[PDB]
Amino acid sequence: TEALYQVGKEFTSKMDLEKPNYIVPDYMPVVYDKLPQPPSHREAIVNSCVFVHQTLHQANARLAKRGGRTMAITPRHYLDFINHYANLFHEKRSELEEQQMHLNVGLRKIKETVDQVEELRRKVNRSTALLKSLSAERERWEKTSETFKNQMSTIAGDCLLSAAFIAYAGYFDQQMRQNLFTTWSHHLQQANIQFRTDIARTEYLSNADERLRWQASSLPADDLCTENAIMLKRFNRYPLIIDPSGQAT
Amino acid sequence: FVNFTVTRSSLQSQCLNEVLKAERPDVDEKRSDLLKLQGEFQLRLRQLEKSLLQALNEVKGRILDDDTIITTLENLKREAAEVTRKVEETDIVMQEVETVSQQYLPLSTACSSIYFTMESLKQIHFLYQYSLQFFLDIYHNVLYENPNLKGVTDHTQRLSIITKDLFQVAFNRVARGMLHQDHITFAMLLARIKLKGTVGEPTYDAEFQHFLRGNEIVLSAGSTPRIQGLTVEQAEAVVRLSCLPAFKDLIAKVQADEQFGIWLDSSSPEQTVPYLWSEETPATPIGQAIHRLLLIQAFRPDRLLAMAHMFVSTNLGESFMSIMEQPLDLTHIVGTEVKPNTPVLMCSVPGYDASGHVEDLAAEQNTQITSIAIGSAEGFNQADKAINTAVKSGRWVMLKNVHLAPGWLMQLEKKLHSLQPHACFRLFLTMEINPKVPVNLLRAGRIFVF
Numbered sequence: 001t002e003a004l005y006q007v008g009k010e011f012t013s014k015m016d017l018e019k020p021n022y023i024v025p026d027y028m029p030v031v032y033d034k035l036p037q038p039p040s041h042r043e044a045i046v047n048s049c050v051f052v053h054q055t056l057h058q059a060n061a062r063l064a065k066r067g068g069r070t071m072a073i074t075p076r077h078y079l080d081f082i083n084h085y086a087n088l089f090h091e092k093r094s095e096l097e098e099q100q101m102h103l104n105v106g107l108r109k110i111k112e113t114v115d116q117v118e119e120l121r122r123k124v125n126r127s128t129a130l131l132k133s134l135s136a137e138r139e140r141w142e143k144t145s146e147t148f149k150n151q152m153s154t155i156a157g158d159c160l161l162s163a164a165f166i167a168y169a170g171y172f173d174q175q176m177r178q179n180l181f182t183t184w185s186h187h188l189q190q191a192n193i194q195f196r197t198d199i200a201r202t203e204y205l206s207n208a209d210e211r212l213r214w215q216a217s218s219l220p221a222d223d224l225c226t227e228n229a230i231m232l233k234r235f236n237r238y239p240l241i242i243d244p245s246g247q248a249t
Numbered sequence: 250f251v252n253f254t255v256t257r258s259s260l261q262s263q264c265l266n267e268v269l270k271a272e273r274p275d276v277d278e279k280r281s282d283l284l285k286l287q288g289e290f291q292l293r294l295r296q297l298e299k300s301l302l303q304a305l306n307e308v309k310g311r312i313l314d315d316d317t318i319i320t321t322l323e324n325l326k327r328e329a330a331e332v333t334r335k336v337e338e339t340d341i342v343m344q345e346v347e348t349v350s351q352q353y354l355p356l357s358t359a360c361s362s363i364y365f366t367m368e369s370l371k372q373i374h375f376l377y378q379y380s381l382q383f384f385l386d387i388y389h390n391v392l393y394e395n396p397n398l399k400g401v402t403d404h405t406q407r408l409s410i411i412t413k414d415l416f417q418v419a420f421n422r423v424a425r426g427m428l429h430q431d432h433i434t435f436a437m438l439l440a441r442i443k444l445k446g447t448v449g450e451p452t453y454d455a456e457f458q459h460f461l462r463g464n465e466i467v468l469s470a471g472s473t474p475r476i477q478g479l480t481v482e483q484a485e486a487v488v489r490l491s492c493l494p495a496f497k498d499l500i501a502k503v504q505a506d507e508q509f510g511i512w513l514d515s516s517s518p519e520q521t522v523p524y525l526w527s528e529e530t531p532a533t534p535i536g537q538a539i540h541r542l543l544l545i546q547a548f549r550p551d552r553l554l555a556m557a558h559m560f561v562s563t564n565l566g567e568s569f570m571s572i573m574e575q576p577l578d579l580t581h582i583v584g585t586e587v588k589p590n591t592p593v594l595m596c597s598v599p600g601y602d603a604s605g606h607v608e609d610l611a612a613e614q615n616t617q618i619t620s621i622a623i624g625s626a627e628g629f630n631q632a633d634k635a636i637n638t639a640v641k642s643g644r645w646v647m648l649k650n651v652h653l654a655p656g657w658l659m660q661l662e663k664k665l666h667s668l669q670p671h672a673c674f675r676l677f678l679t680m681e682i683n684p685k686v687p688v689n690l691l692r693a694g695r696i697f698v699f
Contacts, residue, residue, distance in 0.1 A: 071250065099295065106302055116310030126315035133322040140329050171250035175258035196287075198343070203288035222263045224253075231251045243253035245381075 004050040004078060005031045009043070011082045015089055017042040017156055025192040030054065044191050045156060049085070051187050052164045053078050059172075059180060071171050080236050084163035088234075092155050100148050107141060110134070157188045157195025162205055166231055171242065174224050202226045205234065220247060255381060257361045264357035264388065265350060271392045272407065276349045279342050282335060290332050301325050355446045356412055360388065362442045363419050366435075370423075373431055375684050376596060376698070378691035379423070387422055390586060391415045416443060416565060421572045425582075426596070426696030432573060433557050440564040444535060455493070456539050460546060464489045475500060478510040486547040495526045495540060499547075518549050519556040538563045579697070580610055587695055589669045592661075592676040594694040599681055603699040607647055607677050619646045629657055636664070636676070643673035652680040655687055662690045 022041040030051040035043060056073055064070040114134060121127050164184055169177045181201075188195050202211075202223065214229045215221065228248070232239055241248045270277045282290075304321045311317070335342075364384045370377035392398075397410050416439055424432050441457070444450060468488045475484050487503070490496040502525055503509050512518050519541070526532075526540040538560045545556040561569055583593060597603045604620070611618045619635045622628050635646045651658065665676070678694065680686060 102299075106298070109302060109305065113305050113310045117312070120310065120312050123312060123315075126312055126319075129319055130312070130315060133319065133326070136326055137322065140326075171252045173252070173254070173256040173258055174262055175256070178258075200284055200287065203284050208289050208292075222259065222266070224259050224262070228251050228253055239251045241251050241253065244255070245253070248251070248253045 001031050001050055001054065002033055004053055004075075005033075005046055007075075007078070008046040008049045008082055011079075011086065012042065012046055012049070015086055016093075017045050019153065019156075023192065025190065028187070028191045041156075041193075044193060045160065048157075048160060048184075048187055048191055048193060049078075049082065052081065052160075052168065052184055055183055055187075056168050056180070059176065059183075063176070076237070077168060081163055081167040083236055084167045084234070085160055088163050088166075089155065089159040092159055093152075096148065096152060096155065100145070103141060103144060103148070110137065110141075154194050154196050157193040158199060158204065160193075161185065161188070161195060161199070162201055165201055165227070166205070166234055167236075169227075170231060177224075177227070202230065205230045218247065257365060260361040260364055261354075261357040264360040265353060267388065267392070268353050268356055268411075269350065272353070272404065272411070273349060276346055280346055283339065283342060283346070286332075286335055286339065290335070294328055294332055297325055297328060353408070355448075356408065356415070359412065359442055359446045360384075360415070362445070363416070363439065366438050366442065367419070367423055370427075370435070373434065374428060375688070376682055376686075376691060376696060377427060378688050378696070380692045383422075383695075384419075386586070387418055388415070391418050394585075412443075412446070413566065417569065417572070420569065424573055425577065426594075426698050428698060432570065433554055433561070436561040436565065436570065437557055440561050443565060447535075450533060450535055453536065453539050456495070456543060459490070459493050460539075460543055463493065464546060466492060468492065475503060476510075478513060479503065483548060490543060490547045493543070495528060496543065498527055499525060513548060515549075517552065517555070519545055519552045519559060534563050577606075577697075579606065580614055582695075583610070583675055584614070587675070589672055589674045589676070590665065592665060592678055592690075592694040594691060594696045595677060595679040595699065596682045596686075596696055597679070597699040599683075601699055603697075604647070604649055604679050606699070607679075611645065616645055619644050621646070621648055623648050623651045623657070624653060629654075640669050640671055640674055643671040645675045645677065647677040647679065649679040650681070651678045652683055652686050655685050658687045658690050662687060662693055665693070 019041040022044075024038040028044075028047070030047050034047065039047065053073070056077075060070045060073060117127065117130055117134075161181065161184055165177070165181060169180050172180065185195070206226070206229070210233065211226065211229075214226070219225055219229055225247075232241075243249060269280070301318075301321045304318055308318050364381070367379050367384060370379065391411060391414050395411070395414055397414055398407060401407050401410060420435065420439060424435060427435065445452065464486065466489060468485060471488055472481060472485045474481060475487065479487065487499050491499050506523065509523060512521070512523060515521075522541050522544060525544060528536075528540075532540065542556055542560055545552050558570070587593065595603045595607070607618065608620075619639060621632045621635055623632060632646070632648055635644070638644070639646045661678075678690075682698070
């Protein structure tokens with residue numbers, strides 16, 4: 001557990017996982033040599049990562065007890081999980097920042113159009129409509145910027161959950177995948193890590209175009225098939241498909 | 250590891266999705282809106298806001314004709330308002346969707362149970378090969394082409410109707426290709442599934458365990474003749490049922506009872522069974538039938554099959570097996586509900602012939618049949634030629650006694666895996682029930698036992 005904690009911390013050091021406003025909850029002990037008694041946000045995230053790994057061993061052992069049919073978990077799985085976490089976090093933060101700067105550019109452009117309207121007045125009937133629509137768009141975009149601010153804080157836990165699902169929750173049926181996801185979610189809640197409540201993995205990890213292409217390429221519409229397709233798209237270790245039929249092939 | 254294997258929960262989820270798509274399209278649309286709230290909704294909101302951006306830099310802030318930008322601005326306002334209403338309503342919508350899913354969950358659990366009981370019928374006999382597509386066809390038939398769903402629209406009686414015809418269609422479609430002595434076994438399995446499904450009725454797990462294995466517990470020490478009318482093996486059966494808490498006082502009751510002897514010698518004792526089980530609360534018909542079934546297993550085990558039939562009637566509805574009693578009507582089975590991809594496999598008990606059925610059906614449906622004997626190599630050649638010619642036109646090629654050459658059935662199954670140009674084309678394979686018939690062919694075709 002100390003080795004997993006150390007390697008997770010060293011690999012997640014590059015990622016910006018610092019939230020000064022993060023308030024330390026009680027309990028949630030996984031690593032028994034946590035550097036501070038009150039852990040920081042980054043250290044709490046690394047503790048959540050090592051917990052994900054340990055609880056995957058726990059789930060595998062309990063599956064072996066209740067009917068066998070288990071695959072062993074290796075540190076390569078942990079490294080793949082951390083790599084997925086890093087790449088997904090970077091991608092989502094990059095898209096969020098790009099959308100924010102696009103919104104700012106649009107703000108400057110609409111302000112220039114406001115200047116044009118002001119110069120043109122100096123018909124009034126159309127001008128009143130232009131000004132009221134301008135005001136409405138103003139508060140709409142102010143709330144857009146604020147909800148982007150709110151979404152930014154939530155990116156850390158969501159990418160952790162999604163990476164744990166992509167890397168770890170394979171070979172596992174729907175019930176076990178959901179049980180693992182809800183256990184990780186409960187751990188993040190007990191660690192007071194802000195992740196988006198009741199998120200669905202599929203749309204957060206796939207676009208409408210990607211899903212449309214998958215359906216057009218003979219993919220079943222079941223949720224399990226959608227998650228499997230997501231894994232088949234965002235892979236680091238080359239996939240191994242266990243398909244009794246030939247639908248996946 | 251990317252696993253595509255279907256399981257209990259995968260089928261439960263798929264069934265729930267399909268039934269919530271068909272029965273409650275509005276709830277499914279609310280689901281889709283909820284899933285696009287996190288995804289596509291803000292995406293195309295951004296796309297239309299960008300559209301307003303290029304409209305703005307195209308009009309250059311024009312004022313003489315302001316409606317060109319006013320229409321776009323009000324469209325953005327309307328979409329933003331709609332998204333605001335949806336996001337503000339996420340919790341009510343999600344709790345309503347959860348309640349609706351809870352309303353439709355027992356159906357999905359029952360469907361997964363029915364498939365995995367049907368899939369596990371391989372142990373009973375080698376001929377019971379069923380694919381996933383077979384059960385999905387059963388489900389698609391019970392959803393859309395259900396004659397009992399044409400009038401009812403109350404969304405609460407419709408669920409009970411769907412479940413009832415689901416069980417009935419599953420039995421009818423499986424038992425038509427299943428031995429007669431196995432009909433009662435499948436009916437009991439379905440009755441247990443529905444007993445688990447139904448609400449307000451105890452599981453009776455202890456009684457089921459006693460009924461299956463509990464009579465075989467070791468109770469040699471303590472066997473006494475009781476009354477002279479009760480024989481020694483019936484006495485030990487009494488002992489094993491006295492192990493069960495419900496039937497603790499059988500011995501005292503049978504000394505107390507004086508009309509028990511004539512019932513023990515009754516022609517059909519199952520029709521009128523004395524009340525023996527001790528329970529304060531008057532049991533529901535199902536529990537009463539359970540107690541009666543346990544007693545029939547104890548006293549007069551020769552009436553076990555008919556008592557099981559009466560249990561199937563009391564649990565799965567009276568005349569649940571009545572479809573089997575009436576003569577088999579295969580014209581509807583081949584005219585519809587059977588794709589030309591699936592060949593109709595005619596399996597018959599050794600010493601019986603089944604080609605007369607397809608012959609007089611073709612007479613009833615005035616259709617040409619290319620009947621071909623398969624024994625000779627020229628038989629192989631002419632069968633292949635007939636298939637190749639009939640897929641082009643739609644002739645009903647019927648092979649006979651085809652169990653003789655399993656390798657050619659490898660080839661035939663692989664060939665029929667490829668699609669058929671003509672929809673009206675049908676294929677019939679008459680064969681004997683022997684363990685050398687391809688399992689893949691049995692799984693890929695509809696099996697009829699004669």
